[PDB]
Amino acid sequence: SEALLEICQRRHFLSGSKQQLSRDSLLSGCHPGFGPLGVELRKNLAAEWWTSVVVFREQVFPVDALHHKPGPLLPGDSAFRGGRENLLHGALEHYVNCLDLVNKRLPYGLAQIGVCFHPVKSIGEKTEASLVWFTPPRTSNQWLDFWLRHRLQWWRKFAMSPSNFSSSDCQDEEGRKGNKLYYNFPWGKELIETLWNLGDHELLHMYPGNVSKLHGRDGRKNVVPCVLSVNGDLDRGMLAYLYDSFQRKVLKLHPCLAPIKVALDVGRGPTLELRQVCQGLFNELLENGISVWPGYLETMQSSLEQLYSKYDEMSILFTVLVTETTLENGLIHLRSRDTTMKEMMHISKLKDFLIKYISSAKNV
Amino acid sequence: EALLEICQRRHFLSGSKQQLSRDSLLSGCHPGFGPLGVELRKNLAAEWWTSVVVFREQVFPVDALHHKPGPLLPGDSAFRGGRENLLHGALEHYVNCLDLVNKRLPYGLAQIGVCFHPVKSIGEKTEASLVWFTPPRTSNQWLDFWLRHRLQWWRKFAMSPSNFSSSDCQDEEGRKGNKLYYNFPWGKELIETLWNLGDHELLHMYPGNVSKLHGRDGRKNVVPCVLSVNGDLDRGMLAYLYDSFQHRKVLKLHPCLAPIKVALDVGRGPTLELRQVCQGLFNELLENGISVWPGYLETMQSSLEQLYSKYDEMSILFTVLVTETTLENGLIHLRSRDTTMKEMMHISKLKDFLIKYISSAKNV
């Protein structure tokens, strides 16, 4: 029973009047959408998942699975319009050609990140992140044991209290054996990801006919793969990550995640020169790939308290202020979203600063 | 013919010589893209966003939807919800997300996302659209502003900018707009739309109350002119791929655009102790934001030439080799692509090299 969800509108993480902010609407995927920051938080979040599963470990590749389903369909079932339910289906279909992609060796998976449609009657839109891992029966229980473990330490990575993220085992959906990751929300836990061991089923359903046209070599042993589908919902995550950045107000979000890094403005200074060197910096930063809020284009001052208590209400790692005292040396000063402190620093070092503060937090 | 067939064999597209063929493509019908088609499109994506959405921060990311439940108007062609563009979606923010610049005009809402259109059948198109709101006074100047800009964007990546035509045009729900066309082999095709609509659609969006939409043009409180700009990333991806071809194959595609930049495996060598260095680079480069095709995993050495005609058939800027005359002194030989040149080079000074080859290239 908090207001955090409001702050998500006042600072644009969410859109819509106080009605549409119905925890349902949100959870169930029937909200009107996110505000600029949210988007970024999601775009930001996602890439972090792409770099955490596609980048480094590559012999896994991106797949473009359509949104709707043309042609025929099945007898009844609670489905509307014909658009994708999940991202797995599209993935599978590719399995046979992209199988060439790895000189036909296993294991190997296809990744994608897109929006999926769940009916609730009205529709729902959720941005899920999926990787359909094909496996050699031999090491099938093994990889599941694997990912799960891995995937968990991922989310906990960015948390300010990781232990609210937990794992669980379970069985028989489309086969026994499976896992689930949850985020604990003040009211209760909710599902943010699914990890099942599809076995050679579905796949065989999709490809009736031959058994050889598939089964990619194992270790000289040509065997029909075991479909392992890992599908995690990004909106409900992006949503989870937020409560984790709250209890003053302030949104303590893990840097690499933040919708925007630093924001700069102006203090006891004139104008031109201020928003002179300012322009330069704005460009210096984005140049080096850093999100910056051009506060310096704003009006008055709105005090500094008003200003600080919004930037915090927006999760802006840092808040740097430039005053005429700058143009005579290179002295500006930043206020840490957290340490609420305001050291001073030499502008030109600002650049390499944020770069490493992030470059650091990134490792940790 | 020629090129196309390649785009499948080298996984840029998915499907037989049937599915893939003009109509199927143009008409956003083809079944999809391979892990390469992806990247190129993906690169072309941000490569756009960092050419419009980033800088000039007064342009923000939006999150329109894909369907429109609830009451709307009954007639013409569409599919229950299924968006036809990002514009209507966008507008649904102009009010709320105006409190982002305190009504200060001009200012724009951008978003990239797949839209859907009738072909009956369904055509999917990744669209990049900027919804720019502007004071009646500058409306033209901006339309003219963008056109010239937008155009330079395309010609900038082409290896024959003189195949990228732009033409003036009038009438619609607004006077004046623009069209961008690429010089495919069968004539010209539309890939971009620049329309100065005027407050029209807007007022229909928001009837009755008129002050609720004033934007402070200077000190003035006035209502904006929606200049909608919409390009086709897919139909474009098809352009650049074509503007990079015309046994002499090699897809001479531009760098910060190329799906995979550097390739890599081994020549006159053994294994592992080598494929151990091939993890020292791989892991490095990715860590540096560089696309690398993990050659070394390959098997049957099978021709030194077979690779070059493949890597060229893939469009991989450079191709780097690791042999025995390496491990000892560290020297590794890399090839080119376009320039089909070759050279020695300490394995160390390589990550730096590429980083700049593309880096400087992006500076043109």
Swiss-Prot record, chain B:
Its BP terms in the Gene Ontology are: DNA-templated DNA replication; in utero embryonic development; mitochondrial DNA replication; positive regulation of DNA-directed DNA polymerase activity
Cross-referenced InterPro entries: aa-tRNA-synth_II/BPL/LPL, Anticodon-bd, Anticodon-bd_dom_sf, Gly-tRNA_synthase/POLG2, POLG2_C
**This protein's record includes keyword GTP-binding:** no
MF terms from GO for this chain are: DNA polymerase binding; DNA polymerase processivity factor activity; DNA-directed DNA polymerase activity; double-stranded DNA binding; identical protein binding
What does UniProt give as GO cellular component? Answer: cytoplasm; gamma DNA polymerase complex; mitochondrial matrix; mitochondrial nucleoid; mitochondrion
Q: Which residues form a coiled coil?
A: none
Phenotype when changing D312Y? In MTDPS16B; decreased DNA polymerase processivity factor activity; results in decreased stability; affects the secondary structure as shown by circular dichroism spectroscopy
Q: Where in the cell is it found?
A: Mitochondrion; Mitochondrion matrix, Mitochondrion nucleoid
Question: Which keywords label this protein?
Answer: Disease variant, DNA replication, DNA-binding, Mitochondrion, Mitochondrion nucleoid, Phosphoprotein, Primary mitochondrial disease, Progressive external ophthalmoplegia, Transit peptide
Entry annotated with the keyword Phosphoprotein: yes
Illness: Progressive external ophthalmoplegia with mitochondrial DNA deletions, autosomal dominant, 4: A disorder characterized by progressive weakness of ocular muscles and levator muscle of the upper eyelid. In a minority of cases, it is associated with skeletal myopathy, which predominantly involves axial or proximal muscles and which causes abnormal fatigability and even permanent muscle weakness. Ragged-red fibers and atrophy are found on muscle biopsy. A large proportion of chronic ophthalmoplegias are associated with other symptoms, leading to a multisystemic pattern of this disease. Mitochondrial DNA depletion syndrome 16, hepatic type: An autosomal recessive disorder characterized by poor feeding, difficulty breathing, abdominal distention, an abnormal carnitine profile, metabolic acidosis and hepatic failure in the neonatal period. Severe mtDNA depletion is observed in liver and muscle biopsies.
Q: How does it assemble?
A: Heterotrimer composed of a catalytic subunit and a homodimer of accessory subunits (POLG:POLG2).
Its biological purpose is as follows: Accessory subunit of DNA polymerase gamma solely responsible for replication of mitochondrial DNA (mtDNA). Acts as an allosteric regulator of the holoenzyme activities. Enhances the polymerase activity and the processivity of POLG by increasing its interactions with the DNA template. Suppresses POLG exonucleolytic proofreading especially toward homopolymeric templates bearing mismatched termini. Binds to single-stranded DNA.
Q: By what name is this protein known?
A: DNA polymerase subunit gamma-2
Taxonomy of origin reads:
Eukaryota, Metazoa, Chordata, Craniata, Vertebrata
